[PDB]
């Protein structure tokens, strides 16, 4: 009886063979990394270092994402929050959170815990939920979402584009940055995006961005923040306190 991906899920939590990996933000214009979205990857024993598409679907199923995640954001705090000194005021620091968790309040809790391991107002916290994860729980019971703005925790709307509340930032999904300059549908749909995050006041970030064309097109239109392998991939904790390190000593 080789145990199933139930128990091995739950035995490499244990383990905590889930890790951080941080991609930089950076601004629209350019310039230093002004955040970080924490991508979860499980460092396995036996296979390598696997990638969330495989493993993330059974975790939100099972209901153990929402323990994932925890963990995930307790070692953030861990991996950052004696460097706040590398931290540009404001940090942003993302986590991708399920449907499950919008599920009554401990997430609160959760964001109190990690904000209190750094310096009071010198990060920003950001939740991306997908549009569809807001579906299925619409709308009504939500002081959650209170609760969360009024300890300054933000919501963004991971892959946007691919209703309602108090959200703060829009991420336009890479689909739409793909097809920039190849195509002139995709391109007015993506102004038109752009053109609504402004009149609703909301920040948005373009997500792939891989190529100069890319990044120029989106920043002639304002666009707030870029993150893609054109500004940085996903990386280990090591690479990115490397990597601000020598930020901090030029700029
Ligand atoms: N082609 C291309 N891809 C790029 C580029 N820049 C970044 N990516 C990849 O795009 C994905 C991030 O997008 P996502 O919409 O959050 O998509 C994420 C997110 O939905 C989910 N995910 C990752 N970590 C977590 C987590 O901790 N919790 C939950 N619920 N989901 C997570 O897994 C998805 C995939 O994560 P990854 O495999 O790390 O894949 C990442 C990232 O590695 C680029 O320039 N080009
Ligand atoms: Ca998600
Ligand atoms: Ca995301
Ligand atoms: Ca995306």
Known sequence: ??????????????????????????????????????????????????????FIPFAERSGLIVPMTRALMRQVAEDLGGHAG??????????????????????????????????????????ELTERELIESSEVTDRLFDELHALGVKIA???????????????????????IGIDTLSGHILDSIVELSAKLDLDIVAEGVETPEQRDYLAARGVDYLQGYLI????????????????????
């Open 157 to 179: 709307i991971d892959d946007f584009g691919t209703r309602k509340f108090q959200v703060d930032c829009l991420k336009i999904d890479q689909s739409f940055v793909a097809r």
């Open 1 to 54: 009886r080789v145990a199933s991906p139930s128990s091995e899920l739950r035995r490499a939590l244990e383990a905590n063979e889930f890790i951080p990996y941080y991609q930089p933000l950076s601004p629209g214009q350019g310039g230093r990394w002004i955040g970080v979205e924490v991508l979860m990857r499980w460092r396995h024993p036996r296979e390598g270092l696997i990638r969330p598409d495989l």
């Open 86 to 127: 590398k931290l540009e005021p404001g940090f942003h620091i993302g986590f991708n959170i399920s449907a499950t968790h919008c599920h009554e309040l401990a997430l609160v809790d959760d964001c109190r815990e990690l904000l209190a391991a750094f310096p009071p107002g010198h990060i920003t916290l950001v939740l």
């Open 232 to 251: 940085g991939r996903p990386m280990p904790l090591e690479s990115l306190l490397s990597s601000l390190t020598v930020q901090e000593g030029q700029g």
